[PDB]
Write a protein that binds this ligand. Structure first.
Ligand code: MG
Ligand code: MG
Ligand code: MG
Ligand code: MG
Ligand code: MG
Ligand code: MG
Ligand code: MG
Ligand code: MG
Lengths: 61, 159, 205, 170, 293
RNA sequence: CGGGGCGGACUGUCCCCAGUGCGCCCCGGGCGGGUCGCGCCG
RNA sequence: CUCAACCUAUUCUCAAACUUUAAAUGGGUAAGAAGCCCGGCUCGCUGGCGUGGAGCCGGGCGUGGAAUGCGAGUGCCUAG
RNA sequence: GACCCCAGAAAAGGUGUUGGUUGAUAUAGACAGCAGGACGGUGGCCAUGGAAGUCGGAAUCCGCUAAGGAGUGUGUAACA
RNA sequence: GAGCAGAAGGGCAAAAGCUCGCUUGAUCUUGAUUUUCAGUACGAAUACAGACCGUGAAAGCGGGGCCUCACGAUCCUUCU
RNA sequence: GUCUACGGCCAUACCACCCUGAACGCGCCCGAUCUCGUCUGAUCUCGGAAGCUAAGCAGGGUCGGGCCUGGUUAGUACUUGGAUGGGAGACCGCCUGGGAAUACCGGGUGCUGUAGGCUU
């Protein structure tokens, strides 16, 4: 009739068999969840990087 | 059997320290948080808006977003056999700058200065931290005074 | 209709005081904790003797009452009704429960209050008697007799303190002389050398 | 000798008429206070329902007003005429304020009216020195300090000196 | 004794003091948080404000932005420097509040170089005016009124300082509900009685009102007005000359500090050795007086 | 463990009684670390 | 004269659902090249200000910035 | 009596023996034995039917003394 | 040591309590996130963004109740 | 050496009582025509400048309470890991590392940012 209710016994042994891996961090994390007003302005800044290229290469040279 | 309430078991966790109740000091609202800096999540209970969940109290994360009153923090959370990066919105009353990153950033600037000076002067200097080495050989003077004899004291029932 | 004390000898539970959560607790059997000449001044009874437990255990309020009466009767016989002062230094603040059997079995087995016990630690003082110097042998015998009312192992000790105070008997008198101590009923008041000078001027006058 | 900024003065007078119930009795009482002060009084309600007194919570029970300045000094003299300048010793509180009562309001200097009744009232003179208002100011409010306070003995001395009053040893 | 001592040892052990400037009754920290704290997505952008504090004898107008190490005042103008420019008497009134608000605006704009641009309303009229930024030019300086603990009802002098600053060229958000010309019943702004208040015509009306009724009360009230020979018929022109002088030269020249001998006026703190000696001497005097009997 | 000369403050010994710090300079005794230190010994 | 309650200074004994204080063991993060430092360019966001913030483009820096050990990363199908 | 878990024991006792702690007496004669004395006021007071040291309530002294409690027990109705 | 609707805990003093004045942010929208979690849903919650408003002199605050509870798929119906 | 305006940390800053306060200031203070609020010009708002440091405020004092920081308590309490350690148990000791809190006894009694004054 009655049986065991709950245990975390042997759970930690199972977790560490394949390791508890930290999430794979890498360059260029995603922009999900960032402020929409800030985000749509950065798109305008990226779009208009074309102009001022002549000034950039003049300064770099 | 345990309830699933969002603030179960936070009776002392979100309570204010002794004789530190009342108005929140204003410099906590004047801290500048940018994208990429490391912040400890505390979770004070005077402000009930933007409270982090109790599983993030004491955790440290990295800011990825800044709003008018809060920040978005990427903070690791361990769920059974996996760790996954949560993103939480926390008002600035419940965070503070982590000094571990400040200490390391200080040591980087000192290291780059030390390399710069050593190259321009003509020296090589150890920049890595080394673990505490075994003690060096030394002489201990008695100064003409014999060491004091120590003996265990007799037992007696104190009180 | 009380269980044998062997069923509640050990501190197995957490402390379970009578509070707003534990209600319906019967009164402890011991209600009197001081006997003899409780009104005697501090310098009348310079000798202090303790019964000290050596076991981390529980003593029932029934046993404390029995041992209190047993020590009182011997002290009265050998020292008179005003030749001593006894203080029981254990209070039965822990409620023990009983799961009363005639639903049947272990279902809903949490018990109802049954009585109260005092939790005693190793080296803790159970009982104290203060008296004159010439009654040292009578105090030891009185405390020895009261040992038989308790489950564990207890030691009789003659304290180096003066009476029921916390000051040593070999420096008590000259502290009173130099006004570091002032009697107040059965005890003393320690007056430190700090505070308003008006208190100091109340002394020395 | 004394600093001129320490002389005692009257802050307010605080007349009060506690009628038992609400209605035409209370309206007549407020009429009496208005005739006495030239100044519209305010009704006060009952904190709690007490049926041994016959009152209920939030029911208009009493009427009161506070008078300051020259008009207060005039009304106090009118009240002290009735008392014959005889205030008992215990009428003075430990904070330097005193008070008394009168049983009939007609002898205050108000002509009788058949419609209006026989209302009595309470006088409560609140004494003060210049500078007492710092406890009431909004910005940088403070206390007045120990020397600047008024004791029962100083209030009694002021009454004896100013109104040549008699303090009965009651 | 009959009653428990409320302020016993346990009371003081658990007592938490409020903030120091709350205990002195100088700062409303509920208002200060909403008013000095910048949005976090604006980072180190300063949030400027105009602190208007009216004193028993002075008007203080400052512009500050909050930092962690304390506030930073970038421009301050006082009403006690008004004798340099026209008006010499009758400070801490509505007309002087306008003058010091205008002086603060002109002083700050001169510090930033935005003088010719953002002149403001040179011709003083009481109606609503709000400076607009000019394209191709640096934007208008924006700050917010900080009234402190003042009760902001219609006619308060802090709104006189605000009116001077917005007419000086500063952009401060406001409504004309709190200017003296506003009428609560009709819910309309007169804008002409407000101009009179700016020009001190209500004070001039009082002077001639007292002149006709009781000359003794007139002397008692405006005693320092007979000195310096200020009359009601010349009040308005005096304030207009004050405005023009403020416009022409708002630069503050700090008075050079004089040589002073270093003097200790307040008693220094007694040392530990002195305190112990004082206790020993007091004890000795008690014993000596006792043996005298 | 202390000695000299000027400024405040304290004491129910007040006669110009007694005692305590502080700021500047002149001396004295003791302790420790650096010193091309300098010598002598191992 | 005496006993109550009251107040004051003490005194005995306690708390899973009390607490000023407060461990040990424990939990998170950091210990660089995706870093640091220079210049410049873009922005419709922000704005006293060539102001802030973010993004982008060039350049120079390697003593590879604790110990120890180990080769890692990633996908599909899947039984019990 | 005889070895983790583990398969049987407690309070309380012992002039069995062993070690330890504290104290006391003693050549000014300990201790134990054997042998003498163990007195007067006073058969002290209050208690009662009788309580004389010895059913009890209080007192608790003095002289002679080497010493002898106005009493440690047995005993008597009380004595003895 | 009161009060904040209620259970308890947290929090709160020119507050979050009390009294007034004006109001309807308890409204219209798209996503993101947190909580339970399988990292599914519901419920609840957090931070924004776009409208239209309220209030205040303004900074601001407000898309319900100071926070932790107060609730509900497919199919069908009904309204907009 | 101080003060004012605005503050940061939020008692080393608070609380009780006493003493002193030069100059500016800050106040108390005088009045209700206007602006504006009241039962009450007490508060608030406004217009002032005869008087006063009595109060607030500032500084100092008190074998002051509190608070802050040390010593002690104490290598004590508790505790990581270990043993075919002890003990009928309850519990205790040792090894290996970490290590408190009262009482009691000392010392201290706001630092400071920006702007602007006074101080022969
Ligand atoms: Mg199962
Ligand atoms: Mg049985
Ligand atoms: Mg149990
Ligand atoms: Mg406000
Ligand atoms: Mg919106
Ligand atoms: Mg809410
Ligand atoms: Mg103290
Ligand atoms: Mg250990």
């Amino acid at each position: 009739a009655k049986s065991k209710n709950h245990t975390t016994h042997n759970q930690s042994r199972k977790w560490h068999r394949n390791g508890i891996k930290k999430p794979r961090s890498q360059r260029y994390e995603s922009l999900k969840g960032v402020d929409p007003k800030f985000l749509r302005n950065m798109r305008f800044a990226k779009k208009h990087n074309k102009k001022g290229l002549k000034k950039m290469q003049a300064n770099n040279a | 059997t345990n309830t699933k309430g969002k603030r179960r078991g936070t009776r002392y966790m979100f309570s204010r320290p002794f004789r530190k109740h009342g108005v929140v000091p204003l410099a906590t609202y004047m801290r500048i948080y940018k994208k990429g800096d490391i912040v400890d999540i505390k979770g004070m209970g005077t402000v009930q808006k933007g409270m982090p969940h109790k599983c993030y109290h004491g955790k440290t994360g990295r800011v990825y977003n800044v709003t008018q009153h809060a920040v978005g923090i990427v903070v690791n959370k361990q769920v059974k056999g996996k760790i996954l990066a949560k993103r939480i919105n926390v008002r600035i009353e419940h965070i503070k700058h982590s000094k571990s990153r400040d200490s390391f950033l200080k040591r980087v600037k000192e290291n780059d200065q030390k390399k710069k000076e050593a190259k321009e002067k003509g020296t090589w200097v150890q920049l890595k931290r080394q673990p505490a080495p075994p003690r060096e050989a030394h002489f201990v003077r008695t100064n003409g005074k014999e060491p004091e004899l120590l003996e265990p004291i007799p037992y007696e029932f104190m009180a | 209709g009380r269980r044998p004390a062997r069923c509640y000898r050990y501190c197995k539970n957490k402390p379970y005081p009578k509070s707003r959560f534990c209600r319906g607790v019967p009164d402890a059997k011991i209600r009197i904790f001081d006997l003899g000449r409780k009104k005697a001044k501090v310098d009348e009874f310079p000798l202090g003797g303790h019964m000290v437990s050596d076991e981390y255990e529980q003593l029932s309020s029934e046993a404390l009452e029995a041992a209190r009466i047993c020590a009182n009767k011997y002290m009265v016989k050998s020292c008179g009704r005003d030749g001593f002062h006894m203080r029981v230094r254990l209070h039965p603040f822990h409620v023990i429960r009983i799961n009363k059997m005639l639903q049947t079995g272990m279902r809903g087995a949490f018990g109802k209050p049954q009585g109260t016990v005092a939790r005693v630690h190793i080296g803790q003082v159970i009982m104290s008697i203060r008296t004159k110097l010439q009654n040292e042998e009578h105090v030891i015998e009185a405390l020895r007799r009261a040992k038989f009312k308790f489950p564990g192992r207890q030691k009789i000790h003659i304290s180096k303190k003066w009476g029921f105070t916390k000051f040593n008997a070999d420096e008590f008198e000259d502290m009173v002389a130099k006004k570091c101590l002032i009697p107040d009923g059965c005890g003393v008041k320690y007056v430190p050398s700090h505070g308003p000078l008006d208190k100091w001027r109340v002394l020395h006058s | 000798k004394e600093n001129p900024m320490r002389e005692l003065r009257i802050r307010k007078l605080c007349l009060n008429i506690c009628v038992g119930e609400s209605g035409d009795r209370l309206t007549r009482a407020a009429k009496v206070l208005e005739q006495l002060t030239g100044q519209t009084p305010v009704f006060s309600k009952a904190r709690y329902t007490v049926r041994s007194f016959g009152i209920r919570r939030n029911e208009k029970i009493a009427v009161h007003c506070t008078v300051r300045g020259a008009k207060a000094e005039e009304i106090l003299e009118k009240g002290l005429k009735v008392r014959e300048y005889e205030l008992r010793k215990n009428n003075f509180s430990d904070t330097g304020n005193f008070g008394f009562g009168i049983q009939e309001h007609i002898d205050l200097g108000i002509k009788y009216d058949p419609s209006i009744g026989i209302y009595g009232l309470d006088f409560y003179v609140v004494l003060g020195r210049p500078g007492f208002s710092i406890a009431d100011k909004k910005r940088r409010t403070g206390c007045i300090g120990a020397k600047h306070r008024i004791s029962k003995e100083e209030a009694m001395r002021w009454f004896q000196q100013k109104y040549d009053g008699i303090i009965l040893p009651g | 004794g009959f009653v428990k001592v409320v302020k016993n040892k346990a009371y003081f052990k658990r007592y938490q003091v409020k903030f120091r400037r709350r205990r002195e009754g100088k700062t409303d920290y509920y208002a200060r948080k909403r008013l000095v704290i910048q949005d976090k997505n604006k980072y180190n952008t300063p949030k400027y404000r105009m602190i208007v504090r009216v004193t028993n004898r002075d008007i203080i107008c400052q512009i500050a932005y909050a930092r962690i190490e304390g506030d930073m005042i970038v421009c301050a103008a006082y009403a006690h420097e008004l004798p340099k420019y026209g008006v010499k008497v009758g400070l801490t009134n509505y007309a002087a509040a306008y003058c010091t608000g205008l002086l603060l605006a002109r002083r700050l704009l001169n510090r930033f170089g935005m003088d010719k641009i953002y002149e403001g309303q040179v011709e003083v009229t009481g109606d609503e005016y709000n400076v607009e930024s000019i394209d191709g030019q640096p934007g208008a300086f924006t700050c917010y009124l900080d009234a402190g603990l003042a009760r902001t009802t219609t006619g308060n002098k802090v709104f006189g300082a605000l009116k001077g600053a917005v007419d000086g060229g500063l952009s401060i958000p406001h409504s004309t509900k709190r200017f003296p010309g506003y009428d609560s019943e009709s819910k309309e702004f007169n804008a002409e009685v407000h101009r009179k208040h700016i020009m001190g015509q209500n004070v001039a009306d009082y002077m001639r009102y007292l002149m006709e009724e009781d000359e003794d009360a007139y002397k008692k009230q405006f005693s320092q007005y007979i000195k310096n020979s200020v009359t009601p018929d010349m009040m308005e022109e005096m304030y207009k000359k004050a405005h023009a002088a403020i416009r022409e030269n708002p630069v503050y020249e700090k008075k050079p500090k004089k040589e002073v001998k270093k003097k200790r006026w307040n008693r220094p703190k007694m040392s530990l050795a002195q305190k112990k000696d004082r206790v020993a001497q007091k004890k000795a005097s008690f014993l000596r007086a006792q043996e005298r009997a």
